[PDB]
Amino acid sequence: MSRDAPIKADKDYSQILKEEFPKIDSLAQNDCNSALDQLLVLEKKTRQASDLASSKEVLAKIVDLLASRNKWDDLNEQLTLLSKKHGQLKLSIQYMIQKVMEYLKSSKSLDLNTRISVIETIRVVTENKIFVEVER
């Protein structure tokens, strides 16, 4: 580490993600299809349990396992996850669209006709504050 701040592992609910990631450093390195059914099961629990201060760290890599092992259909579900409980302003969670635009955008050169089954279904729930404008 280049910074002079000490490596105090303060460990909030993200401690799960810190302790399961080394179990998956063995499994994603050998199969990863079964690693998806471990790391994103945390996201699925953390959103529901209101432990989501952990979710916030899983969800940025949901596009690295879920879109990767051909569960790109569930990247739409992950933009939906946080948006389930409340009809809140989508611009606050449109930040997660960036992951849909990160690797779900191009997963093994993902075909338009396949990706449409993500982008056009999540369009229905995200046109509610449109894609073009921001916090205007």
The DSSP result for 19-86, as a single string, is HHHHHHHHHTTTT-HHHHHHHHHHHHHHHHTT-TTTHHHHTTTHHHHTTTTT-THHHHHHHHHTTSS-
| Closest CA relative to residue 65, chosen from 93, 98, 91, 102 | 102
Give the single-character DSSP code of 16: H
Going by C-beta distance under 8 Å and a sequence separation of 6 or more, which residues neighbour residue 111? none
By CB atoms closer than 10 A (0-12, 13-18, 19+), residue 39 is: buried
Residue with tokens 């879920």: 66
Of 53, 55, 124, which Cα lies nearest the Cα of 90? Answer: 124
Nearest by Cα to 32 from 76, 68, 59: 68
Other residues' Cβ atoms within 10 Å of the Cβ of residue 61: 18
∠ CA 19-84-32, nearest 5°, is 35
The rounded radius of gyration (Å) of the Cα atoms in the chain is 16
Kindly state the greatest CA–CA separation across the chain: 50
Burial environment of residue 27 by CB neighbours within 10 A (0 to 12, 13 to 18, 19 or more): middle
